[PDB]
Structure formats: structure tokens, C-alpha cells
Design a protein around this nucleic acid. Structure first.
Lengths: 75, 333, 424, 305, 333
DNA sequence: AGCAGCTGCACCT
DNA sequence: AGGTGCAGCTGCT
């Protein structure tokens, strides 16, 4: 059950684990082919919570890409 | 007369949070710059070890549960790899004025209580309770698991009157057992000191330092914290040790519970050893309450028979209720 | 009339919950006997439980679940002394709390549902024909039902406290003492909890949080609460303590009342040459945040130049006190004064920030340090302040930059006086 | 209301297991009413027998260490508890949450009586120290003497004695012993000022004390609206929920010889400041005063600015 | 009579964290100042070698994945380029008093359990269990992957009575295999010492040092930690090795799991070799439960048949039950 | 001749 | 890691 936020995709790791007694899964955030992050989130997390875990990294990507590819300024 | 609606005994025998440190044996006299034992983290991977239900004995389901790894993060505390001696240090103040409650709604009940404990001190001193407390300071009972399997334990108690040391006691805590109560001249002198502190004739201050010879790099056992679970959330760290300013420590109430393990007069047995004193004297390890209210040996009915009904119990039960007075509590309806 | 019909529907909903617990052995016999008795005398059954209810603002059960005492419903008088916040100020914001058994809380939920829609919340007592025609009971039974709601709205408690409550002593002016038994304000924390959970999550709060990441500004207010502590009330069953304890899930949120530096971190004063040379500047985390907040205010115009200059003076006085506190904590923290390998001018300022001479420290060097006070190190601190305050021809050519430099020099003079008071 | 003739300094008081919560809204430093009750019990215990009265407290909080934890998926915090003993049936106990902490605080105490008249200052300071080394401050024990051998003795300092410049120099050399910690004052005037300038939008008072002590992040006209100091919430005192009650008419009182009342906490704003920012060292003394015609039972620190 | 609700056993055979250091072979008798093996980082470019989903086996997608490879930072630990011998050192204390639980509810259950283990000790000593524990110390099984492909392994075991060595054992750990349990005089003397420690008749503390001759600059394998998240705020660090004071180290539970690999009586086979003693004795490397509860040979059914219904199993399974008691754990509902 | 306690059961979200 | 009440209960006299 992958999650797509624009060009980003968050996929689970196809076999979970037990952290602290609770079942978890590793979610990977990709921007196309480039792997951006990995988190270990529990089960009984809705997809909105999985989105809001990676929303900060997505927002920092947007900030850096907006500042890097800013157009030129004439005065 | 009746019981007061409020009753509140401030505790005596206030201990400190016992801090841990480490070093080598036969350097324990110069053990003031010994570095603290710190709390680290590590990872554990376990298996399924608990009892399964009768519905879940299926072997395919057991293998499918095994093939998911079980991982925890665990706080640990060890000795350094070149030190073999754990040093546990705390301070214990004895206040005195063991009879007076901090709160009493009934005035005549508090006067009857005051003359009752006054007559109890007049009948005999605190020397039974004081000798038992000095035993629990002599053998290292406050080393809870750190004492178990140790090679040699040694306790030093410094009575400090002014800013310097008034007197020193030196004990081999493994000769003094945890079962019986002996009599020794140094131990009886310490018993006189803590009895005189309990009698209101002074404010005694003690520094207790215990040296346990465990081994190089072995594990020590400080107190554990109470963390209630974040159930519908991420997994937590499944052990958390107590630390005071990055030094592994035992809780104050843990040392206090180890101190008042004096009660050898509970009706169930006498060879199982002393227990801690509390109303309906109940040990958490056995999970079972000795001194039940259906027999007349718990604290509340004994206090009501001694004060309200003026039926003085036996001298060991007067010792028990006096120990519950020193222990403190919030009693009432 | 019609309100009465609605009440019957509410009773049916209760029956449905019972229905889920279905047993093929004898569950139909208990179900028919329960449903017929409910449809006949739901109000008569509910009034006996509603006698146990109490409508209250202040509860004793959060102090201890074992404790039993009088819980009072009142809104206290407006206090005369200024600078005060309390539960008394927001009277229209108030919500009523319920104390009783959980079966009584079922009837409390039924009464709260009956209050909605029509005017039957105030009209459960003040009505006869419209109440009894909808209730479908006799006029004597309707009067007995109205008396039950009037009693449940009232307190019905003998004045008393418990042994597990606080009951503290306040001293009088030149006289004896008074006992004060403080009660847990429950409506007040429920209101503060509503405001906090509104500030933390809403479409407004989440929209402003996404707008901070997007950095594109619409007119909005965005609140943020750091390090609240969560306190769980009683056991795992929150309904035992109060009714609103079940709605807030038995937890109340506590705002930080902490001192400023409550997480002590060891500072490495020790002997590096570049370590002492860079520690002469000594930029810390909170000092860095204060420096950014001060540097943002610099370009401000003259229309807010008075308040902006007052804020800059307050920031400079806070930074000087933070530097003094950091020097004091660094001096107390290190046990000795360790010699440094190749540390010139880091040792030069560290002699001004020095503790007493140690066993490794020389008596001659210690006497030379004790003889001369380090005011020149304060001049070096002024060089740090010129490093902190950016100046140029926009400030040097204008008149405001000279006044800002004069205020910074006055703050540096006060700091130099405080520093030179120790040595010499 | 009464300017002290002298100040006594309880030098470095270490306290274990002190109460942290102290209020239904705050959890940090304990309430100043605990310190006022401390010196009133100290006056009851050793103050009366020396022809000395004690009036207020100045508190500076050298160090803090709360027994809390953060539960690994949330930004809030929980408290660490204790294992209470079992019930009489041996089942379990009921978990009531209490919040413990560790404190390092110094106390500034004002004196009006025959201070240097009947007894010299050193013996008064020593026996007040010996009395305070046997009680507990805020629900937690005063931790006794350890290998801190240096900070033991006090300094009974006469306020108005000497020249005024010498008065400033001795209060500065006493402030030299109060450097690491940050003193605590009341800020009811700043609260009312912000309440009046906030009331241009809406007339609410508790929402002010909410909005005073958080991190308000205002949008770009990204900034953080900031107060110049360390503004915290404090329990400002007590306001009665009830009329006066006679000593016998309420059951389960602490005593049947003292009148009783039912009360509520009034909450206000305090402020932590560096002790060098105040010039007169008697400005920090927290006095508690009763207005028994109504419910206003207050701790504050008047005569501060 | 039924089993207790809570019932818990503290572990005997407590090891410490094993520390790694490096040196040259035949200087191994002077191996007290050998410098530690340090954990470094290096960059790793990961290729594509997973099984594909076959909804992603299109060649253009595969070549697009191969054109953009991902990179990690990885903790690594090697020997120095001039040292060829890995030295691994830990301490192990044998305690004794194995039958007594540290927590119990029923008194009748713990008395029945205590007399059961007392009858076990009286039938035979700990000689089989201590023989197998001494074998697992003799072969260097606690070198998990460092033993694999080593040229020569030598174990020095020092029984340490006071602060100095009481007795010394020297073992060629490649002659003593990992498969069977032979007989040897020095090995039987070590087994008698461990059995004397397990019987409560002494306080056993041993220092175990192992030297493995691997090669110059070769990779050693310390214990490995747990990584929950990974981002660009770190170095995309995807492997963390355990470390005590800037020393590559092995977890204490890893050494403990390698010590109790004694179970040769599991019903499935015996040609595989011994496994570690677990309830439902399971191997994480094989994903399988030997001693399934459907067969009557797991720990819980054997313990309940032995204690409650007095059905004493075979002496091999009695060894297995007492091994699970020495291992410790939480056994209850 | 009752009394008081007491244990146990049930409620409920 | 619940408070509550109350129904029923024990009882021996």
C-alpha cells in the first residue's frame, strides 16, 4: 500500500518487525529513483500519519529546490 | 474516644538517592575521585519465550511468529573493564520526635497517643528497632541485586556531627547475614547512636558507603523508572534506569524499603526472613499480604487496641507499631 | 409534546446496545423484560440514578480517587488585586461537571441529550403541560419527575472534606491561622484544555503549520506550545473521577513553569589553544537565538524606533546577563584551572574568567592574576560586542547608531564593573 | 509592607523529591507559597524563641532536575512514578500521579526583631541552619550535608546599617554568592499592562496568561513574538469558593481548633531574572498576606521595582 | 495445585561485554597493552541485487535503476595492517542457587519446585551442564563470525579467586570442535569448577580471553546495533556497530547465547548440532522452532509435567529443563 | 434478639 | 496497575 505525494512515493518494506513489543514497518520515502529517507513506523498508523511523518522532509526539499532554482533578478 | 479523622506521621530515617561509582579493590580508602557509573543504551534481539495460549500452539503460526524479529532498546549500566568494585553512597538523616503526628483532628486522641508513645519509650528504649535498623545498615541490604553473588561487601558509616566526621564504623557485610540479628559492640554503639537520634535527643546525620567486589566490567543494577505506555503510538524503550546528573542511582524509597526490612514477627512464618514494615504487611515480591485484618495483627487494629481500648499488645507487636510510626503514613477513614 | 417523542427514541438507542450482547440460551427473555420495563418506566428508572448525580465545577476526586467529600458548584467573586487569572473570569465559557457512578453518568448523558433541540434544558423543571404530555406520565408522576431533575441540578451534599485532601494553613496578619481546602477546578481545566487542543490542532492550526513550511504568508495567528506535561487522572477508567475526565480521556495538560536553564550540559573549557581562542567569543545556543532575534530588529524605522530601541536595550541587557551567568556556571563547573597546550589569549581571557590557583597553578602566576584585575578582558568583551553589533555608514552616518553604541557601551560598562568587582 | 532590618541567606539548599506539579495548570518550579510556608514554619520552630520575626523569601533556583521523560513519539512529557505497596487483598494499588524533582535553591530571609541585639549574627545563622537541616521544603526532603564542605555557613547581613555606598557594596558582595541561579519575582503589573493592550481586541483575562508565555509564531507581514524576560505562569494564590466555616462544623478537618474554607487557585505571571538586574536586594522577598473579609489570600513580592 | 501467576528467574552465568583489541601472534602472552579495535566509517555504493517484483522486470526500468545507484555510510572494524591477531576479553561469574525464583505467588508451587530441583541435584550434579558450558568456553563459540576461517584460536581462562589468578586453563579451540562433547582432564577440571559454582558451594569468577589468528588488516565482526530511521541529516548511516569506550565490542547477550548452545536433545535431529536452550527451542538463523509445543518436549509442558503431576521426564530433558532454569526468564501467565 | 461486616457481583465507556 | 453500591450472604445464636 504505497503512498504517492506528487513525485514522492512512500513504500513499506514488505516484512515488518517488532519494536518495543509492537509491530512496525520500515517506510522508505523516494523522490523517483533517489531514496530520500527511511523511518520505522508502527502498524495501526493511518496513511495520513505516514504522510505527516515525511511531510517535513518533503517541505525542506521544496524549500531547497525553490531557493536553488530561483530565477535571476534584474534591478 | 475515637480515632481522629485525619492522622499523618512524617517519616523518620530520610535517605538520599544512593549514587554509584566504580573503582578497584584496595583503593577504596582513596575512593573520593572514583568516576561515576553511567547509563548506556544497547539493542537486544530476542525470541518468543513466554507461555503461549492453548489456541496458539499451532506450529506454523509459531514459526511465522519466530520469523519476525523482536527488537528492543535497553538502558544498561556496567562497571568499567578495569574496575571490579562498585561503590554505592547515600546519606541518611535521623530526626527524632517519633511520636508526634503532623496532623491530628482530635486533640484528646493526640494527647492519648503522645502519652502512649511516651510510656512506650519509658518502658524500653528504641534499642530493638535501633539495633535492627543498624543491622540493615550493617549488612548491605540496600545493595538489592548488586549484593547477590558479590565476592566481598564492606560498609563504612560516618556519623558527621559538625562539618567533619564525628565517628566511623567499618563492617564486613557478608559476615552479618540477612536472616538473623546478632549483637556486636560496634554494632550496638551504632544502635545507641541511632536510638538517641530517634529519641529526639539529637539530629543524627550518617554517610553510608558500600563497596561490593563484583568483577571486571560486570553489570550493576540501579533503580528502574516507571513509564506508562503510549499505547496507540510507536514502540518505546523497554527499560529505563534512574540517573542523577549522569550517574546511575538507586531511588530513595528503594533504600528506605531496604532499611525497614526488620519485621520478623509476622504470623505466617519466621524462617522466611524479615519483611518491610507497613500496614497490612505486604511484600510486592511474594505478592501476598501478611498481617491480614481478619487476624488481629495488622497495624490499624493494634493501634486502636493500644490507644482507644488500652489493650497493650505484646512487646514485639509494640515494636511493630512503633516501626510503623517511624515509617510514617497517612492514616484515617 | 414532540420533545417527549424524542426522549422515547433515545431510550430505544440504549436498548440497541443491550441487543449486541445476544445469547441464544436465555437472552431473549432478559431482552423483552428489559425493553418492556424501559418503555414503561424509563423516566422512573432514570430518576433513581439521577439522585446520585451532582452538577459541580470543583471536584475532590482528582486529588485522590479514594477520597470522598463535598464538591461545590460556584463561580467565585471578582478579585480586587490586579494581575490575576482564574476560573471566575469566564462565566459564559463554563461547563458543568458530573460526579457519580457510571450508571448515573448514563442518565446524565440522557438528560444532556434531552436538553438539546427544544428549550427543554431549562424547561425540564419549568413546564407542566408540555413536559407531561411529551413524557406521557401522570401529573403527580410528572411533578415527581420534575423534582428529580431539580434535585439532580442541586448539590445535595453535607459540608465535609476528606483525610486525603490537602487542607493547608494560611497565616493571618498578626493573628492565628486559617484552613484552606483547595479543590481541583474541573471546568477551568476543561476550558483551558479546549483552548489548547484548538491551538494545537485545527484546520487553522494545520494550515498555518503548512504555511510555515510553504513560507507563503496569509494573515493568521499561529500558536505553539512547548513541553507540556501530561498528567493521567486516576486509573485507566477515566469516568470514575468525573464526567469531563472521560471526555478529556483522563489526562490534563500542564504548561511549563520551569527555570531558564533546567537541562545542565557540561561545557568544555579545557586546554586547547584554538579551543580557548574560539571560546573567547563563546557563542552558545540560547545566546545565538538571542543574537538572531536582536539582529533582526536592527533595520527598523523611526516610527517604531522607540519601542525597537527599548527592545534592543532589553536584548543587550539579557545578553550581558547571559554572558555573566555563563561565566559563573563555567567557573563553578570546572574543578581546577587546567594548563592548556599552546593557549595564548585564550588563557589571556581565561585568566580573567579564572578560578583560584590550584596545585598545578603557580603561586607567582596566581599572585600576578590576583594583583591585576582583568578590565582589559572586559575591553575584549567590548570587542566581542562590536562583533555582535554590525555597524557601518548607515549607522555611523546616522544619529541612531551612535545612541545604540552608547547604550551598548553603558551595558558593557555595567558588565565590566560587575567583572572587575571580583578581581583586584 | 515592612522593610527588613536584616537578611539571612540560606546558602545552597539541595532538595530531593520535591513536588513539581504544585498546581492544576503548571508543572515546573514549585509554587512560592511553599517557600513562604517554609519560613513561617521556621519562624514557628526557631524564630519565636530568639526574639526574631521572619517575613519573606527570595528564591534563585541554582539548578533544576525534573523526573520526567518524553514518550518517544510525542512532543509532550510524562512523569516518572513510584511503585506503591500492595493493597490489603494483595492485588495491586491505584496509580495516582505525583511529580518529583530535584532542586538547588538559595533563600533570602528578612528579619525585623532584635537581630544583633540579643545574640550575635553567627550563632543565629548557625542555629537557623541547624533547624532547617531537619525539615522538608516543598514535599521533598532537604538533602543534608555531602562533600560540599565549602557552602555551609550563612551571612546575616544588616540592610540599613553602614553607609549607603557601603550598603551597595555589601549587597553586591552577597550577590556575588548568588550568581549561577536566577531570582524569581511577580509581574502583576506587566500582566495588567498586556491585559489592557490586549483588550483592544477582546475582553478576556485567562487567554492573556495563555498568550503571554508561549512561542507565538506570527506570519510574515515567520517571526516569533517575544517578551524581553523569562515570563512563566505561577500559582498566584487562593480565592475562596466558600464563606468562613467554624472549626467544628466541617468534618475531617486537619484540626477542630482552626477555621476552614474552600478555595481555588488564582494564577498569575512570574519572572525569572538575573540577580544583578535588581539594585536593592530586599526587593525579592515574597510576602504572603491575608484579606479574610473576602477570599484573597495572596503570595507576592511587593516593593520590588 | 496449579502454576504460579508470576514467577521469574534471574540468570546465572552472567557475562560482561566482550572487548576487542589487536596485536601480533606470539606476543599474546604480553597482550595487556594491546590497543583496541576501533570502529571507523566508510562509503558503500550499493548495487541492485534484490529479487524484482516482475511487475518491475522491464529492462528500461532496470537500467534506469542501475544508472542511479544509492550510497550509504557503513561502520566497519578491521585489524590494523601490522597486527594479525584479534583478542576478545570478557569476564563471567557463575553464581549458583539455580532453582530459587526471584518472584513467586504460590508458596506451594515454589516449594514443590524447590524440592524438584533438590531431587535433581541429588540424582546427578551439575556435571553434564557444566561439562557442556566448559566445552562452549573451550571452543571459542563466543567469537561468532571471527572464529569462522580463523587459522588458530587459543582460549585462556583464568579462575580469579582474590584479585589475582587462582588457576589457568589453556585451550586450542579448533581441536575442541563445535559439534560433539569429548572428554579432557583440564576440561573436566574446568567443568568441576563451574559445577561447584552452580551448586552454590563457591563464588566463581573467570576471565576469558580468546586469540584468533585472522590476518593483517582483516575485518573483524563486533556486535551490531539497531537503526530505526535514516536520512540526509545523518550520513545515510545504515550500519552501526556496538562500542564501549571507542572499542569494538560484542554484546553480553551474544556471549551468553553462545555459552548456552548445549541443547543436543531436541527431537527433530541430532546431526545438525547443539542449539541454545530456549522455551520452544528456536533458531533465529533458521526461522524454526525445534521443541514445538505440539510435541511434548518444550520447556513449559515438561516443567508442568515435572512439578505439578510429578511426571519426571528423561534425564536429557531434565538437563534441558534445568538449563532453562539457569538461563532464567519470565515464566507465568 | 440483630448487626455489622463482608465478600461478591455487576455497571459501565 | 476502578469507584460504587448494593444484593446476597454468612451467621451464630
Amino acid at each position: 500500500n504505497a503512498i504517492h505525494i506528487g513525485p514522492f512515493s512512500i513504500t513499506p518494506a514488505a516484512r515488518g518487525l517488532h519494536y518495543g513489543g509492537l509491530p512496525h514497518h520500515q517506510w522508505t520515502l523516494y523522490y523517483g529513483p533517489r531514496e530520500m529517507a527511511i523511518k520505522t513506523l508502527p502498524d495501526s498508523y493511518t496513511s495520513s500519519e505516514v504522510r505527516d511523518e515525511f511531510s517535513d522532509i518533503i517541505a525542506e526539499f521544496v524549500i531547497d529546490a525553490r531557493h536553488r532554482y530561483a530565477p535571476d533578478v534584474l534591478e | 474516644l475515637s480515632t481522629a479523622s485525619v492522622l499523618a506521621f512524617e517519616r523518620k530515617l530520610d535517605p538520599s538517592d544512593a549514587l554509584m561509582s566504580a573503582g578497584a579493590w584496595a583503593q577504596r580508602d582513596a575512593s573520593q575521585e572514583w568516576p561515576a557509573v553511567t547509563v548506556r543504551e544497547k539493542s537486544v534481539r530476542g525470541t518468543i519465550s513466554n507461555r503461549l495460549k492453548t489456541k496458539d500452539r499451532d506450529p506454523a503460526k509459531l514459526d511465522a511468529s519466530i520469523q519476525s524479529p523482536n527488537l528492543q532498546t535497553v538502558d544498561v549500566a556496567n562497571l568499567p573493564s578495569d574496575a571490579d568494585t562498585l561503590k554505592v553512597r547515600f546519606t541518611l538523616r535521623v530526626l527524632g520526635g517519633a511520636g508526634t503526628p503532623s496532623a491530628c483532628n482530635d486533640a484528646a486522641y493526640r494527647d492519648k497517643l503522645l502519652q502512649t508513645v511516651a510510656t512506650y519509650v519509658n518502658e524500653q528504649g528504641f534499642a530493638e528497632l535501633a539495633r535492627r535498623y543498624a543491622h540493615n545498615l550493617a549488612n548491605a541490604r540496600f545493595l538489592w541485586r548488586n549484593r547477590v553473588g558479590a565476592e566481598a561487601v564492606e560498609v563504612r558509616i560516618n556519623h558527621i556531627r559538625q562539618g567533619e566526621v564525628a565517628r566511623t564504623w567499618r563492617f564486613d557485610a557478608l559476615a552479618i547475614g540477612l536472616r538473623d540479628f546478632k549483637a556486636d559492640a560496634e554494632l550496638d554503639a551504632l544502635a545507641e547512636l541511632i536510638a538517641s537520634g530517634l529519641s529526639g535527643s539529637g539530629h543524627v546525620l550518617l554517610e553510608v558507603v558500600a563497596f561490593a567486589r563484583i568483577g571486571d566490567g560486570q553489570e550493576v543494577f540501579p533503580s528502574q523508572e516507571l513509564i506508562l505506555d503510549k499505547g496507540d503510538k510507536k514502540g518505546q524503550k523497554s527499560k529505563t534506569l534512574y540517573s542523577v546528573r549522569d550517574a546511575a542511582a538507586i531511588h530513595s524509597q528503594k533504600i528506605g524499603n531496604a532499611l525497614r526490612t526488620i519485621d520478623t514477627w509476622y504470623p505466617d512464618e519466621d524462617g522466611l526472613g524479615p519483611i518491610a514494615v507497613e500496614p497490612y504487611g505486604s511484600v510486592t515480591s511474594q505478592g501476598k499480604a501478611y498481617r491480614q485484618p481478619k487476624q488481629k495483627l495488622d497495624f490499624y487494629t493494634l493501634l486502636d487496641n493500644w490507644v482507644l481500648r488500652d489493650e497493650a499488645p505484646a512487646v514485639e507487636q509494640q515494636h511493630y507499631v512503633i516501626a510503623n510510626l517511624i515509617r510514617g503514613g497517612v492514616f484515617g477513614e | 409534546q414532540e420533545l417527549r417523542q424524542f426522549i422515547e427514541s433515545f431510550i430505544q438507542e440504549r436498548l440497541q446496545g443491550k441487543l449486541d450482547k445476544l445469547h441464544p440460551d436465555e437472552d431473549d427473555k432478559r431482552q423483552t423484560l428489559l425493553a418492556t420495563h424501559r418503555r414503561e418506566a424509563w423516566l422512573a428508572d432514570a430518576a433513581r440514578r439521577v439522585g446520585q448525580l451532582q452538577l459541580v465545577t470543583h471536584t475532590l476526586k482528582p486529588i485522590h480517587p479514594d477520597a470522598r467529600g463535598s464538591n461545590l458548584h460556584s463561580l467565585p467573586q471578582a478579585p480586587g488585586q490586579p494581575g490575576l487569572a482564574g476560573s471566575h473570569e469566564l462565566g459564559d465559557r463554563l461547563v458543568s461537571d458530573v460526579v457519580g457512578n457510571a450508571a448515573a453518568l448514563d442518565v446524565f448523558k440522557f438528560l444532556s441529550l434531552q436538553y438539546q433541540g427544544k428549550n427543554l434544558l431549562n424547561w425540564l423543571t419549568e413546564d407542566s403541560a408540555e413536559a407531561v404530555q411529551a413524557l406521557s406520565d401522570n401529573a403527580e408522576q410528572a411533578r415527581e419527575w420534575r423534582q428529580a431533575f431539580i434535585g439532580i441540578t442541586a448539590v445535595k451534599g453535607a459540608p465535609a472534606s476528606h483525610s486525603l485532601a490537602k487542607q493547608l494553613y494560611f497565616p493571618l496578619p498578626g493573628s492565628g491561622y486559617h484552613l484552606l481546602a483547595p479543590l481541583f477546578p474541573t471546568s477551568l481545566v476543561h476550558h483551558v484544555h479546549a483552548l489548547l487542543r484548538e491551538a494545537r490542532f485545527g484546520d487553522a492550526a494545520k494550515a498555518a503549520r503548512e504555511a510555515r513550511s510553504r513560507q507563503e504568508s496569509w494573515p493568521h495567528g499561529f500558536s505553539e506550545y512547548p513541553n507540556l506535561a501530561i498528567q493521567k487522572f486516576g486509573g485507566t477508567k477515566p469516568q470514575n473521577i468525573s464526567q469531563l475526565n472521560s471526555e478529556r480521556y483522563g489526562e490534563n495538560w500542564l504548561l511549563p513553569s520551569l527555570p531558564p536553564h533546567w537541562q545542565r550540559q557540561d561545557q568544555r573549557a579545557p586546554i586547547r589553544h584554538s579551543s580557548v581562542f574560539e571560546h573567547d567569543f563563546g557563542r552558545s545556543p540560547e545566546v545565538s537565538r538571542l543574537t538572531r532575534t536582536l539582529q533582526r530588529l536592527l533595520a527598523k524605522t523611526r516610527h517604531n524606533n522607540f519601542t525597537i530601541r527599548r527592545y534592543r536595550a532589553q536584548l543587550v541587557g539579557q545578553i550581558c546577563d547571559e554572558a555573566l551567568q555563563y561565566a559563573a556556571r563555567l567557573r563553578e563547573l570546572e574543578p581546577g584551572w587546567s594548563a592548556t597546550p599552546g593557549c595564548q589569549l585564550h588563557d589571556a581571557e581565561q585568566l580573567w574568567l579564572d578560578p583560584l590557583r590550584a596545585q598545578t597553578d603557580e603561586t607567582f602566576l596566581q599572585r600576578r592574576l590576583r594583583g591585576d584585575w582583568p578590565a582589559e578582558v572586559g575591553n575584549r568583551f567590548a570587542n566581542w560586542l562590536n562583533r555582535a553589533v554590525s555597524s557601518d555608514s548607515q549607522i555611523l552616518g546616522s544619529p541612531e547608531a551612535a545612541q545604540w553604541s552608547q547604550e551598548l557601551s553603558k551595558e558593557l560598562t555595567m558588565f565590566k564593573e560587575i567583572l572587575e568587582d571580583e578581581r583586584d | 509592607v515592612t522593610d527588613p532590618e536584616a537578611l539571612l541567606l540560606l546558602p545552597r539548599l539541595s532538595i530531593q523529591n520535591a513536588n513539581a506539579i504544585s498546581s492544576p495548570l503548571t508543572w515546573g518550579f514549585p509554587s512560592p507559597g511553599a517557600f513562604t510556608g517554609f519560613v513561617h514554619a521556621l519562624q514557628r520552630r526557631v524564630g519565636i524563641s530568639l526574639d526574631i520575626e521572619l517575613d519573606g523569601v527570595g528564591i534563585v533556583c541554582h539548578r533544576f532536575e525534573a523526573q520526567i521523560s518524553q514518550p518517544a513519539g510525542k512532543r509532550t512529557k510524562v512523569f516518572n512514578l513510584t511503585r506503591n505497596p500492595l493493597n490489603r487483598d494483595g492485588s495491586t494499588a491505584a496509580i495516582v500521579e505525583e511529580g518529583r524533582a530535584h532542586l538547588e535553591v538559595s533563600l533570602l530571609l528578612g528579619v525585623h526583631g532584635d537581630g544583633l541585639d540579643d545574640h550575635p549574627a553567627q550563632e543565629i545563622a548557625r542555629q537557623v541552619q541547624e533547624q532547617a537541616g531537619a525539615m522538608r521544603l516543598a514535599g521533598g526532603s532537604i538533602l543534608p550535608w555531602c562533600n560540599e564542605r565549602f557552602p555551609a555557613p550563612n551571612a546575616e547581613l544588616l540592610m540599613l546599617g553602614g553607609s549607603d555606598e557601603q550598603r551597595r557594596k555589601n549587597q553586591r558582595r552577597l550577590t556575588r554568592r548568588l550568581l549561577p541561579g536566577f531570582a524569581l519575582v511577580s509581574r502583576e503589573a506587566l500582566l495588567q499592562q498586556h491585559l489592557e493592550t490586549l483588550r483592544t481586541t477582546l475582553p478576556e483575562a485567562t487567554t492573556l496568561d495563555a498568550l503571554l508565555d508561549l512561542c507565538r509564531i506570527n506570519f510574515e507581514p515567520w517571526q516569533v513574538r517575544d517578551k524581553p524576560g523569562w515570563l512563566v505562569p505561577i500559582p498566584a494564590g487562593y480565592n475562596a469558593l466558600s464563606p468562613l466555616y467554624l472549626p467544628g462544623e466541617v468534618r475531617n478537618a486537619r484540626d477542630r481548633e482552626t477555621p476552614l474554607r474552600f478555595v481555588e487557585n488564582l494564577f498569575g505571571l512570574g519572572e525569572w531574572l538575573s540577580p544583578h538586574r535588581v539594585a536593592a536586594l530586599s526587593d525579592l522577598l515574597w510576602y504572603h498576606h491575608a484579606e479574610p473579609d473576602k477570599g484573597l489570600y495572596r503570595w507576592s513580592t511587593p516593593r520590588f521595582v
